[PDB]
Design a binder for this molecule. Structure first.
Ligand SMILES: CCCCCCCCOCCOCCOCCOCCO
Ligand SMILES: CCCCCCCCOCCOCCOCCOCCO
Ligand SMILES: CCCCCCCCOCCOCCOCCOCCO
Ligand SMILES: [Mg+2]
Length: 302
């Protein structure tokens, strides 16, 4: 190996039916990119990776750009990246409607444009951490730390962190005729424990998430407790069924409570490593009704 250059990509096309909403067709979250890896010596490799996505607006942007340094002490990755909390993720096995019980992304949307992320893998035991450099009060603050381990057929992880947006859009303000965004200074603090159990052709995952949204210079404080119970079952050769139940409750320090349930059931056929097809129903519900959703998609990879 001198190093490799890998052009890669994913063509995604999806049809979505959201209850009491107009169906959509599209190719958002289609990706294309370049992953270059260069070996300097037997204890130091470099990575440059860039990934372009499609938006849904036809506009094409840089979804990720990464400089990686691989050493005998883990990888350090700098640049615009998904959060460590997003890499670690949790017991959401959906393609369309799940993941409501994973609370790390409320402000960050799983992205920070200027982080350093760290990864150390030992013998079925790992550590992942990340720091988002705040700048010009455009870049949010982020600090994250997760640990995981595998014990036979049981894989576990825990961790969390804290994410602050000093100018987060929470709504809109109209005085007389002029309209301006309402920004708040919000901190999301969160912690998570996940266990995933492999039992034959079945996988069962449970994730507990806790979070607190704390506004600065404003009394509001919202606590969130979330559980996700999900599973996949190999029914045929390249066919998994999957399903999940997600419950989150939010309790505001002002006494207002909200909660929401999301259930999903679907099927995945992995034709080959480069193509897959999937379909899924979602039943949503919560205090404020009974949304019924359906989605079907296909992916080509290169
Ligand atoms: C993504 C972070 C780079 O490491 C990939 C694998 O690390 C061990 C897996 O740890 C499980 C949690 O992260 C899943 C993403 O690989
Ligand atoms: C490059 C790793 C630096 C990450 C520091 C994060 C520490 C984890 O706690 C964050 C919650 O506060
Ligand atoms: C209930 O939660 C399922 C697993 O929770 C995290 C892993 O801890 C179980 C290991 O004994
Ligand atoms: Mg997906």
């Amino acid at each position: 190996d001198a190093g490799t250059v890998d052009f890669y990509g994913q063509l995604r096309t999806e049809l979505k039916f959201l209850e009491d909403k107009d169906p959509t067709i599209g190719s958002g979250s289609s990706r294309a990119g370049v992953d270059a890896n260069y070996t300097v010596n037997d204890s130091l490799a470099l990575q440059g990776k860039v990934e372009f996505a499609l938006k849904d607006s036809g506009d094409m942007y840089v979804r990720n750009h990464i400089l990686g340094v691989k050493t005998n002490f883990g990888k350090f990755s700098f640049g615009k990246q998904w959060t460590t909390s997003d890499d670690v993720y949790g017991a959401d096995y959906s393609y369309f409607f799940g993941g409501t019980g994973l609370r790390y992304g409320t402000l960050s949307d799983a992205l920070h444009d200027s982080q350093v992320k760290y990864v150390y893998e030992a013998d079925s035991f790992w550590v992942k951490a990340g720091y988002g450099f705040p700048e010009d009060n455009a870049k949010q603050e982020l600090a994250e730390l997760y640990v995981g381990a595998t014990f036979g057929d049981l894989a576990v992880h825990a961790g969390g962190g804290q994410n602050r947006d000093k100018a987060f859009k929470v709504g809109s303000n109209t005085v007389g005729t002029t309209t301006t965004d309402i920004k708040a200074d919000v901190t999301n603090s969160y912690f998570e424990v996940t266990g995933e159990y492999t039992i034959g052709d079945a996988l069962i995952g449970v994730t507990y998430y806790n979070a607190e949204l704390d506004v600065e210079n404003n009394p509001l404080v919202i606590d969130e407790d979330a559980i996700s119970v999900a599973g996949t079952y190999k029914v045929a050769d390249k066919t998994k069924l999957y399903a999940g139940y997600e419950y989150v409750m939010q309790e505001a320090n002002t006494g207002a409570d909200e909660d929401g349930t999301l259930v999903y059931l679907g099927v995945e056929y992995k034709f080959a490593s480069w193509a897959r097809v999937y379909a899924e129903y979602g039943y949503g519900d919560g205090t404020t009704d009974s949304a019924n959703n359906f989605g079907i998609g296909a992916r080509y990879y290169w």
